Design a protein around this ligand. Structure first.
Ligand SMILES: [Cl-]
Ligand SMILES: [Cl-]
Ligand SMILES: [Cl-]
Ligand SMILES: [Cl-]
Ligand SMILES: [Cl-]
Length: 333
């Protein structure tokens, strides 16, 4: 009668097999450190979500990064912390060193191990075809890892990918939107940035999973190899789905909607209208074609699917021909 249930193709029961305290962050008691152990050196970033600083740990004289958290509910604080601690040590994941509160203002702050202040977006139009493939693979390492640990990032975008290009290190950051995947659980669709929102969020389908991150990844890849940021440039929530439909076509969208018995606002159907699927070659021009290959296009085609269950898992993506030489070359890192 209502929306048909969905389940993740992989890593479905990971949290179920874990002990309760692994995923139950509300019951987790946060062990706070001392803010006095850290002194701020200089400001790095600034937004609606955080204030980021270069800082020093006076106890061992180590360079660290401090993120002053904007006042969100304690539940969101505990969730990010618990997730970061569970993922700590994982490949290409940011490393939470400590957690502190201001002695006076009580404002929480996250302390990470040092990374260089250069994200993917400032760089992902400057490097070669092999570098795109290389870093895309590094992102997949992180995505496959956190997914295998039962965690959805839900905010994949080049701004949340720090790259130390000098040492070819990559870190997936900003786990403030991340959440644990539990079979049958309905999640908030107000996650991720508009340009990177998957079709599931735009049609208000709540029983999504890890595959949400894969769509976001597809959008990132599309923008790079086509030199178009963002690739899907919706001016509002409705328009975002329109921009996607103008590329993937309306046929697969309506099939997807019917498949899960999704109910759209009646006016949304007329807005979407009818559009034919566009071939990926149509976005290729002489100023980006050096980043384009048949492997790339097929890989992208296998990420950007309306049906979240049809999208490649992180692991399947990692062994796609697109990364063939990268994998071979990495085998002698
Ligand atoms: Cl929970
Ligand atoms: Cl971004
Ligand atoms: Cl949620
Ligand atoms: Cl567009
Ligand atoms: Cl996955």
């Amino acid at each position: 009668s209502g929306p048909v249930p969905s389940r993740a193709r992989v890593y479905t029961d990971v949290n179920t097999h874990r002990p309760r305290e692994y995923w139950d962050y509300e019951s987790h008691v946060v062990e706070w450190g001392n803010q006095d152990d850290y002194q701020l050196v200089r400001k790095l970033g600034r937004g609606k979500y955080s204030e980021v600083f270069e800082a020093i740990n006076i106890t061992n004289n180590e360079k660290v990064v401090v993120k002053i958290l904007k006042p969100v509910k304690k539940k969101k604080i505990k969730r990010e912390i618990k997730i970061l601690e569970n993922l700590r040590g994982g490949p290409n994941i940011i490393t939470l060193a400590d957690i502190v509160k201001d002695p006076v203002s009580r404002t929480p702050a996250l302390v990470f191990e040092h990374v260089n202040n250069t994200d993917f977006k400032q760089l992902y139009q400057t490097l070669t075809d092999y570098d795109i493939r290389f870093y895309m693979y590094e992102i997949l390492k992180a995505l496959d890892y956190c997914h295998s640990m039962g965690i959805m990032h839900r905010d994949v975008k080049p701004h949340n990918v720090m790259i130390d290009h000098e040492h070819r290190k990559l870190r997936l950051i900003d786990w403030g939107l991340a959440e644990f995947y539990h079979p049958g659980q309905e999640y908030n669709v107000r996650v991720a940035s508009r340009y990177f929102k998957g079709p599931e969020l735009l049609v208000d389908y709540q029983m999504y999973d890890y595959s949400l991150d894969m769509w976001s990844l597809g959008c990132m890849l599309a923008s790079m190899i086509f030199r178009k940021e963002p690739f899907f440039h919706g001016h509002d929530n409705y328009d975002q789905l329109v921009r996607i439909a103008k590329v993937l076509g309306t046929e697969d969208l309506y099939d997807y909607i019917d498949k899960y018995n999704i109910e759209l606002d009646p006016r949304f159907n007329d807005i979407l209208g009818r559009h034919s699927r566009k071939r990926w070659e149509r976005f290729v021009h002489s100023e980006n074609q050096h980043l384009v290959s048949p492997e790339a296009l097929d890989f992208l085609d296998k990420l950007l699917r309306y049906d979240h269950q049809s999208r490649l898992t992180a692991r399947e993506a990692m062994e796609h021909p697109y990364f063939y030489t990268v994998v071979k070359d990495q085998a002698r890192m």
